[PDB]
Ligand binder design. Structure first.
Ligand SMILES: Nc1ncnc2c1ncn2[C@@H]1O[C@H](COP(=O)(O)OP(=O)(O)OP(=O)(O)O)[C@@H](O)[C@H]1O
Ligand SMILES: [Zn+2]
Length: 1935
RNA sequence: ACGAGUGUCGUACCAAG
RNA sequence: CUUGGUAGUACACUACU
């Protein structure tokens, strides 16, 4: 209500205004006090401000536009010389900043492991291996510094011949659970653990070894890195790599048998045999053995390192009987920052057979071979996790790099993979992070690679492999610019509505970066971007990274303090803003934006709950961290500084609770509270920490106060809705819809570039081709306009740091949706935010207070007054991520200014330009297409980049040097690529993130996260086989982490009534069984769906086996629970009582909400950090209330009386407090507030493998470590199985399960129908990859609103909830209530409640509360399982309907080499007048295009009286359109049927009141101006007709009633003003002659034209006077013949029959002599919705052709070049001998065919379009030629003999194959073969012996003849026959 | 030795003799 | 240097849903 008068007192505002010109200060002042409600209009102030700055904006825009003439065309090209200069400068800077060491022995270990081949001779028994190690260590020959101590270690570990009592002692120690019991000169304490015997080791030797070799108790320069550019160092690195290649690439001499193979080999092989072969090769080599041995050894070292001593060491072993590791004494691994010290020892027979990655200490000659000992290695928990998880990462990297590349050798790939996966140091991060940007910029057309390399790039090479990688990067950067010219665009196949073919040609020419070989462009980009994602997180030590981040922030703030004086500049000064240009841009942008939508303020108040309560906003009541400023002494640093500000970090909701309890916040609506807080809170404090990402330099992250949180939330929500950003998307996790937005933009520029050049060069290329039947050609070719495409992928440098915060002041002051008081208070907040202070973390203060020796130039000391305080003022740096949307809006305004610059600049050259630019937080992608003829392209590019940099500097921004590059066909938005219209993404980045990043929450949590990552990768276009690889690796890693491998601790095979992990649900620690399509589309629920589908297939009669899923489910009533296998009963009980019911709680639920129950049953307990909880103010209140006489039961009663507090976490202050206190009882919500370190969660599963962790309590109440449950995994399985055996299974429960897992959600029904009814078709190659969502996804969504809102409405029983539409909640709640009533949930809940109460005698609040909690949780999960977040997919084609989407998706996920066509037997998808219109616009045009004229009417009548469309009968739709008054749109239909009336013709003539625009024929392509132009525009007493061909309008016939030139011109002007749609500008000019009238066109606006009719004298006279004085002149186009017709011309029904005696069309009839009645076309992708009885004509089936989508093209070339699989789809002869009968009914009209025309642009590409064919180009002729080719192709392909196809010897093989196909059940590739055979025998005239087949039963014969038959090479039959053979052999093996 | 680093660190801690 | 005793998180973590 009242404003903030304190705003005009602020020192920040005082500085802001004095920095501005006096008139600008005034205009700002009147801008602040402007009220949009109290003035005449809402734009008076904005219009005034825009007009004030109009002159200066025009001056700047013109000055920047005229700079295209001052360009020179010499931009930044990163060729070899520039790269070399940058490399030299970088070397100089690095040698300055580092201490370069040229010694080879100063290398750090590249891999902290030395390996040797396992000995086939020695045994694998632990004691024998220990004896061997001892004896070999004792016999060391030679002398060194530690040889004596090593031999003493050998002495003190021998046991002699006392092994039996040794193993007895060890076994007894293990059985009982410390005293050293000496065996033989060895004080054994445990298995493989020994006590240091001072009698066997010298004192000096022991002390020296323990202090120097291991550094145990032994306790300024520059970092010492190796010489990366030295010749000797690079040669040594090459020798190391070559030695590793030589030794590790030898075969293991084993048999690969592991979990991954035995579980997923069939799937991976049936998706790609190559991938299976690659895995089989990898598993046989020494690389996999080495990595597995190292991982197992590391696991053993971590396991045994718990209870050590100060003189004890351990001998950890592994599966390799030649590799041992000594675990030297250290701290307990499960402690804080605990390290482990070890030393690898290898015993090998012969020297140089040792893996030395720079870690070997020395190899010595012992008895019977050599012994090799590595150096001591000290590692922490995090790097140990990476070491353990390395095998999966290595396998994934190998299969990503080798996938589909015959020109890359596996050994080199595996060398790189092993040296990159086991590297746990920053040395490789410092190269992987910059290499991406460096190589991408280097390949670019224009970029700053030289500058980036020279003054930013800094390799950090402490290892030899780092030197190798640096050399590889140098070579790749040298070669990128000289190989950029090897990419070529693909031939574009566009059809004026879609681009069928687009992208980069698959030319494998580009040289591989890391490998010897050649790669394609996509593979090259993968190799560039893939190495970024191997890097580990949390490698930064806080001790150094914290001071690094502090140095960065403090240095930037010091620079801003002492170097930036002026804020507003006009010469693009860095970190300055052009004031007037900014003001004008804000005016224009706000005025444009506030015009599209009207209720903008209403949307702000509604979508952000500004009028609601504080407790209803998720961002204010979450579990995140906040900041508290105050005194926390109770909860050396304090008594050091008198200005030290105390602080603590708490949770968001806890701070909200504290604020509510202390009356700081009230129950007023949130916006009022925030508005008061804008003036109440005047000091803002922020604290920073390290994010811990994988980049070489970490990023600072700032935590703020809750008051700052509310106040910034207000501003961000005000500015967010003005942006064009989707409000359901994440800034942190950008949605995949951008990948489609990029594609749409690329298509738009592609169409613009294709059309504009053609339009401007038609006459030039015509003059050229006329001379082709010489220098004139060169002159014409130089005189034409050429095309250009540019895309500037840029990122802004210091988006949050180096920005002018003063521009947001103007942005707020110009916002008209805000009252003067609101602007006052928001500006007061902005001023106070400019005065925020950064509090240094106390860890940093401790680090800096232990210095003593002072830093030479300590900036922190200088601006903390020698650490007098810990607070630093930060003025111009708005903190990272606090102002995303406002900065995005300002960036969009800047880009609008840049677009204006480019548009004016190009109009200065009389060209055409089209610019689109996407603006995210700071990432940029601007696409520019320019067509002109004035200057060269290089000058255009130079000017574009110069003005781009200037525009960014204009608004205080600054583009990065590292991330800004320009390209001709590579668009790069946020982690997404668009390769010339074809979308592209690096799918491997998700697989690597799934393999590396693991939260270790539990088995299902990790498995679900990894499967979700695999699903996302599939959605990003991952090949199916590699997705199976990732899924298998996820399974194997999850099973290895929790000891689930067969024979381990928690293996559940022997505890469940199953036989394999396959038959066990993943919810109970099984493996997932589902085709990849279900995984991609649903995720984590595909197992249940697949099990139900398998149940249906197993237990459905054969009569309904091929029907829909609903039809087979209808038979579930006939099912019996008795005749079910125990496994199926087990899984059905699981589904009934754990998915659809809450019979067993995974954990104690008392205190839980409805949304905190997962899909898991056995959730292991996690860390409950007691220390973290004591920091919470509300936790003390919870403790006090718990320790009360009757406090808790009263709270339980209050919750029971208001059950809505379970779903809704609180909606008011009192209710929110009670709900928080209640939730503190969850025993799992306390885990979410605790510290869950992935390191200790990792070590938990290895250290404590038998500790009970699972908190399982059965069916509905039937000193210790921090992590402790009640039962172990084995006990959990046993108890759960016992409990499940106590329930009963009835057929009604099965019906309920099938009704509420499949039948409820339409998406589940659709997926089941696709899985059951799928028919696989012709193989095709991926050439037109395109993004697409699933169309009409509103109709397949069962619950429209969010599950949380639905449950809130259900709890309140109110459909009209605060934030949702009541109309949809009506249906949502009725669905939820129907679910509740049908499953018998509420009444059963009351049954147990009453039964328990009666048993106990009195009411028990706890049991009822638990029951209600289970009820709400089950309802919430049911609603949640309905929504399937199907985001955009990357499909081989474009999808128009749901069935098309499903078919494309299923065909894209069955093979890696090619994608197939999928057809469905029935309708998988199982305003009414609109359906009728679509029904007839299809069938009419279908008959005209594809049906002969003779049979057209008969086919139409058959469809009308027998077919049905979209489950509606066609007859009903025709009756509907008859009743409607829009029948005049279907005049040809009514005439052909006979239902036309004279009233219809009167109405048709009555459509002359508004000029009746009728297109007598459809243009072949109207945008490219192709097709016979036959147009008629008529009004009352006037009509015209236009005829032309593509470019030239032949003649126009005009009929009028009064032949006077004035009336002629007026009538022509009226007619041309109609919505004819014809451009009249693309048409070429025509010669003008006296005495004739010519069609003329004018340009008036920039893109608006006016067409009139004039005379030769008039046009000449006006041209000759206008040419004298841009230049808009009268251009004639077509001559007109004026005629006089006074007649009524009343169209009568009697005339139509006579007129149409020769036209048999169904979509066009001669309503007059020169005018036609037409039916609007409809796309044939929807043609599948029809369903009816088959139409058998001869041998073909029209109804199947109605379904065969691949044959619905109207292009002659596509049909003639098809495959015979389409005919196998069509054919249903049932006893025919000739094919000519069927071909008669097909059409014989001319059909379109393809032509190519080169496009003149810097990316050279050729487009292929459609054009009208000649007389012989008909559908029937294409059919005949296709048959004549493909029948012979198949016959030779399947000859299986020499005599011929018809020879009986071949007929025997055909009989065998058809018998195999028929006896064995039908497969996914069996019908096509047998129908192809039928077609070919029809062709050979031996159809009598196709229905005469029989059997030739032993499967040995079947196996033999299938295996031995040859496979064809040239025909497309190769792949399909291979698939058929593989499937049939697999199935007969299953037999 | 190893991790980190052009920021002084980790490189287990305490008590007894 | 010998003996005894002690040790569960990096107490860690944002804005954007
Ligand atoms: N994890 C995050 N936390 C907070 N804000 C983030 C985060 N990730 C992205 N952002 C937002 O997006 C921007 C991305 O900036 P980016 O990481 O490119 O660095 P920058 O500040 O632009 O500096 P430079 O380009 O020199 O690295 C941030 O400034 C912030 O607005
Ligand atoms: Zn037949």
């Amino acid at each position: 209500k009242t404003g903030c008068p304190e705003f005009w007192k602020h020192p920040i505002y005082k500085e802001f205004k004095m920095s501005m010109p006096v008139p600008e200060r005034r205009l700002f002042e009147e801008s602040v006090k402007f009220n949009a409600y109290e003035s005449e209009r809402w734009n008076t102030n904005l219009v005034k401000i825009r007009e004030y700055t109009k002159k200066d904006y025009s001056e700047h825009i013109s000055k920047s536009a005229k700079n295209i003439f001052l360009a020179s065309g010499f931009y930044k090209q990163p060729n070899k010389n520039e790269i070399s200069e940058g490399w030299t400068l970088m070397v100089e800077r690095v040698q300055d900043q580092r201490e370069i060491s040229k010694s080879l022995h100063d290398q750090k270990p590249s891999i902290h492991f030395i390996w040797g081949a396992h000995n086939p001779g020695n045994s694998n028994n632990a004691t024998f291996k220990l004896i061997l190690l001892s004896k070999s260590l004792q016999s060391i020959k030679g002398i060194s510094t530690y040889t004596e101590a090593f031999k003493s270690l050998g002495k003190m570990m021998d046991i002699g011949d006392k092994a039996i009592e040794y193993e007895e002692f060890c076994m007894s120690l293990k059985s009982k659970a410390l005293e050293p019991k000496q065996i033989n000169n060895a004080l054994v304490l445990w298995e493989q653990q020994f006590m240091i015997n001072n009698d066997l080791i010298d004192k000096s030797e022991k002390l020296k070894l323990f202090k120097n070799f291991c550094g145990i108790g032994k306790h300024v320069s520059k970092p010492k890195i190796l010489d990366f550019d030295d010749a000797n160092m690079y040669l040594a690195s090459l020798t190391m790599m070559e030695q590793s290649k030589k030794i590790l690439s030898k075969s293991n001499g084993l048999k690969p048998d592991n979990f991954i193979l035995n579980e997923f080999g069939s799937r991976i092989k049936d998706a790609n045999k190559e991938t299976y072969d690659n895995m089989h090769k990898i598993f046989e080599t020494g690389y996999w053995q080495c990595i597995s041995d190292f991982s197992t050894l590391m696991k053993n070292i971590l396991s045994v390192s718990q209870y050590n001593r100060h003189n004890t060491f351990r001998i950890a072993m592994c599966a390799n009987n030649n590799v041992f590791a000594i675990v030297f004494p250290s701290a307990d691994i499960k402690t804080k920052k605990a390290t482990v010290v070890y030393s690898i020892i290898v015993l090998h027979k012969e020297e140089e057979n040792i893996f030395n990655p720079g870690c070997l200490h020395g190899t010595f000659k012992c008895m019977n071979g050599y012994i090799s000992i590595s150096r001591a290695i000290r590692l922490d928990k995090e790097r140990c996790q990476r070491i353990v998880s390395s095998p999966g990462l290595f396998l994934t990297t190998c299969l990503l790099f080798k996938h589909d590349n015959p020109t890359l050798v596996m050994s080199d790939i595996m060398n790189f993979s092993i040296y990159t996966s086991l590297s746990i140091t920053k040395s490789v991060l410092s190269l992987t992070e910059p290499a991406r940007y460096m190589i991408m910029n280097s390949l670019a057309i224009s970029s700053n690679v030289k500058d980036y390399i020279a003054e930013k790039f800094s390799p950090y090479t402490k290892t030899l492999f780092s030197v190798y990688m640096t050399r590889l990067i140098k070579n790749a950067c040298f070669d990128a610019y000289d190989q950029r010219q090897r990419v070529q665009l693909r031939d574009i196949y566009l059809s004026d509505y879609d681009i069928t073919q687009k992208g980069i040609k698959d030319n494998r020419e580009l040289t591989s970066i890391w490998f010897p070989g050649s790669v394609t462009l996509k593979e090259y980009l993968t190799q560039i971007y893939l190495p970024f994602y191997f890097n580990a997180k949390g490698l930064h030590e806080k001790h150094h990274v914290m001071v690094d981040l502090a140095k960065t922030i403090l240095e930037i703030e010091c620079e801003q303090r002492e170097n930036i004086k002026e804020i507003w500049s006009t010469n693009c000064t860095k970190q300055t803003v052009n004031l007037k240009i900014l003001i004008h841009s804000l005016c224009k942008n706000l005025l444009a934006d506030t015009s599209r939508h009207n209720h903008l303020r209403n949307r702000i108040e509604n979508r952000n709950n500004f009028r609601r309560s504080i407790t209803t906003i998720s961002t204010f009541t979450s579990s995140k961290s906040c900041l508290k400023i105050g005194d926390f002494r109770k909860e050396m640093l304090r008594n050091a500084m008198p200005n030290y500000t105390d602080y603590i970090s708490t949770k968001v909701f806890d701070r909200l609770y504290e604020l509510l309890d202390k009356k700081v916040l009230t129950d007023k609506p949130v916006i009022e509270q925030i508005m008061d807080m804008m003036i109440d809170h005047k000091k803002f404090y922020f604290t920073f920490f390290n994010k811990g990402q994988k980049t070489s330099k970490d990023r600072e992250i700032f935590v703020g106060e809750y008051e700052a949180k509310m106040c910034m939330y207000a501003v961000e929500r005000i500015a967010k809705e003005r942006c064009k950003l989707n409000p359901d998307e994440m800034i942190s996790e950008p949605g995949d819809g951008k990948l489609k937005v990029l594609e749409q933009k690329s298509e738009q520029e592609i169409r613009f570039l294709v059309e504009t050049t053609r339009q401007k060069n038609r006459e030039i290329d015509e003059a050229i081709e006329a001379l082709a039947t010489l220098g004139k050609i060169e002159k014409l070719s130089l005189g034409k306009a050429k095309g250009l495409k540019m895309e500037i992928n840029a990122d802004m440098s210091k988006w949050s740091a180096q920005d002018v915060f003063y521009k947001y002041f103007w942005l707020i002051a110009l916002d008209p949706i805000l009252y003067p008081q609101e602007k006052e208070r928001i500006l007061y907040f902005m001023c106070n935010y400019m005065d925020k202070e950064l509090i240094l973390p106390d860890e940093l203060l401790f680090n800096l207070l232990d210095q003593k020796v002072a830093y030479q130039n300590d900036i922190i000391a200088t601006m903390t007054n020698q650490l007098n305080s810990n607070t630093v003022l930060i003025k111009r740096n708005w903190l990272q991520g606090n102002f995303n949307y406002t900065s995005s809006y300002v960036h969009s305004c800047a880009m609008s200014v840049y677009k204006e610059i480019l548009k004016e600049a190009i109009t200065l050259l009389d060209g055409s330009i089209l610019v689109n630019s996407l603006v995210h937080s700071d990432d940029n992608q601007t696409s520019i297409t320019i067509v002109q003829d004035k200057m060269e392209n290089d000058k255009i590019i130079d000017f574009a980049m110069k003005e781009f940099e200037r525009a960014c500097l204009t608004f205080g921004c600054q583009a990065n040097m590292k991330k800004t590059y320009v390209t001709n066909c590579i668009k790069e938005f946020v982690s997404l690529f668009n390769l010339y219209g074809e979308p592209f993404s690096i799918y491997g980045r998700f697989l690597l993130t799934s393999v590396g990043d693991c939260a270790y929450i539990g088995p299902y949590e990790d498995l679900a996260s990894r499967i979700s990552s695999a699903q996302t990768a599939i959605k990003h276009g991952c090949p199916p086989s590699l997705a199976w690889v990732s899924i298998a690796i996820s399974h194997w890693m999850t099973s290895l982490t929790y000891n689930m491998l067969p024979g381990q601790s928690n293996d559940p095979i022997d505890y469940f009534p199953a036989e394999n992990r396959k038959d066990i649900p993943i919810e109970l620690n099984g493996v997932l069984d589902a085709p990849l399509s279900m995984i991609s589309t649903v995720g984590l629920e595909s197992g249940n769906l697949y099990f139900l589908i398998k149940l249906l297939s197993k237990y459905t009669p054969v009569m309904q086996k091929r029907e829909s899923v609903v039809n087979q489910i209808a038979e579930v009533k006939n099912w019996k629970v008795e005749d079910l296998t125990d496994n199926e009963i087990f899984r059905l009980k699981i589904l009934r009582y754990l998915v659809l019911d809450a019979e067993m709680d995974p954990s104690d639920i008392m205190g839980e909400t409805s949304d905190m129950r997962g899909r898991s049953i056995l959730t292991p307990r996690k860390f409950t950090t007691a220390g973290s909880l004591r920091k919470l103010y509300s936790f003390s209140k919870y403790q006090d209330r718990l320790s009360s006489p009757g406090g808790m039961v009263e709270l339980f009663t209050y919750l029971l009386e208001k059950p809505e507090l379970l779903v809704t976490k609180g909606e008011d202050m009192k209710d929110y407090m009670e709900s928080v206190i209640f939730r503190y009882n969850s025993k799992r919500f306390k885990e979410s507030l605790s510290i869950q370190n992935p390191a200790q969660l990792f070590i938990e599963q290895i250290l404590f493998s038998h500790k009970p962790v699972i908190d399982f309590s059965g069916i509905r109440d039937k000193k210790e470590p921090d992590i402790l449950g009640k039962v172990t995994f084995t006990e959990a399985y046993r108890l759960l199985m016992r409990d499940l055996s106590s329930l009963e299974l009835t057929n009604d429960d099965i019906q309920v399960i099938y009704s509420y897992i499949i039948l409820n959600d339409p998406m589940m029904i659709t997926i089941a129908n696709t899985h059951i009814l799928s028919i696989y078709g012709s193989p095709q190659r991926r050439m037109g990859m395109s993004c697409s969502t699933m169309p009409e996804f509103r109709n397949l969504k069962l619950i429209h609103h969010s599950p949380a809102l639905v449950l809130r409405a259900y709890s309140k029983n109110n459909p009209d909830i605060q934030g949702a539409d009541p109309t949809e909640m009506a249906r949502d709640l009725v669905h939820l209530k129907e679910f509740v009533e049908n499953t018998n949930l509420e009444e059963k809940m009351k049954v147990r409640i009453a039964m328990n109460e009666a048993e106990k005698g009195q009411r028990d609040i706890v049991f009822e509360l638990k029951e209600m909690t289970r009820f709400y949780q089950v309802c919430y999960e049911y609603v949640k399982s309905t929504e399937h977040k199907i985001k955009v997919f990357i499909l081989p084609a474009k999808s128009y309907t749901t069935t098309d989407f499903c078919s494309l998706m299923q065909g894209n996920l069955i093979k890696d080499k090619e994608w197939y066509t999928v057809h469905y037997l029935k309708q998988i998808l199982s305003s009414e007048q609109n359906i009728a219109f679509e029904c007839f616009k299809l069938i009419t045009h279908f008959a005209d295009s594809f049906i002969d004229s003779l049979s057209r009417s008969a086919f139409l009548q058959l469809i009308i009286d027998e077919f049905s469309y979209k489950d509606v009968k066609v007859s009903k739709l025709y009756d509907i359109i008859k009743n409607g008054y829009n029948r005049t749109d279907f005049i040809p239909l009514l005439f052909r049927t006979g239902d036309l009336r004279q009233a219809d013709l009167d109405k048709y003539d009555a459509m002359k009141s508004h000029e009746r625009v009728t297109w007598n024929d459809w243009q072949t392509s109207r945008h490219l101006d192709m097709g016979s132009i036959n147009l008629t525009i008529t009004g009352y007493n006037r009509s015209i007709t236009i005829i032309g061909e593509d470019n030239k309008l032949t003649y126009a016939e005009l009929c009028l009633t009064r032949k006077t030139p004035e009336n002629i011109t007026i009538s022509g002007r009226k007619l041309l003003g109609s919505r004819h749609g014809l451009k009249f500008e693309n048409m070429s000019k025509i010669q003008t002659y006296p005495g004739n009238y010519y069609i003329t066109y004018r340009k008036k606006d920039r893109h608006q034209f006016v067409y009139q009719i004039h005379s030769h004298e008039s046009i000449t006279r006006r041209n000759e006077e206008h040419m004298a004085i841009i230049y808009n002149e009268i251009t004639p186009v077509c001559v007109v013949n004026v005629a006089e017709v006074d007649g009524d011309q009343r169209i009568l029904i009697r005339s139509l029959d006579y007129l149409n005696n020769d036209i048999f069309s169904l979509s066009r009839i001669k309503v007059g002599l020169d005018e036609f009645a037409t039916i609007k076309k409809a796309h044939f992708s929807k043609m599948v919705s029809f369903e009816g009885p088959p139409i058998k004509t001869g041998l073909l089936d029209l109804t199947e052709l109605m379904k065969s989508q691949d044959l619905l093209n109207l292009n002659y070339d596509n049909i003639r070049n098809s495959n015979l699989i389409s005919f196998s789809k069509l054919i249903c002869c049932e006893g025919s001998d000739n094919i000519n009968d069927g071909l008669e009914f097909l059409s014989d009209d001319p059909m379109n065919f393809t032509e190519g025309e080169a496009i003149h642009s810097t990316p050279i590409f050729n487009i292929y379009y459609s054009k009208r064919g000649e007389r012989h180009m008909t559908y029937r002729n294409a059919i005949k030629l296709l048959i004549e080719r493909e029948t012979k192709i198949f016959e030779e392909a399947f000859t299986f003999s020499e005599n011929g196809f018809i020879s009986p010897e071949n007929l025997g093989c055909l009989e065998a194959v058809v018998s195999l196909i028929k006896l064995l059940k039908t497969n996914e590739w069996s019908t096509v073969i047998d129908k192809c055979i039928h077609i070919c025998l029809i062709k050979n005239g031996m159809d009598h012996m196709y229905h005469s087949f029989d059997v030739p039963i032993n499967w040995v014969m079947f196996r033999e003849f299938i295996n031995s038959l040859p496979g064809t090479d040239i025909p497309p039959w190769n792949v399909m026959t291979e698939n058929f053979k593989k499937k049939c052999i697999a199935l007969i093996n299953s037999k």
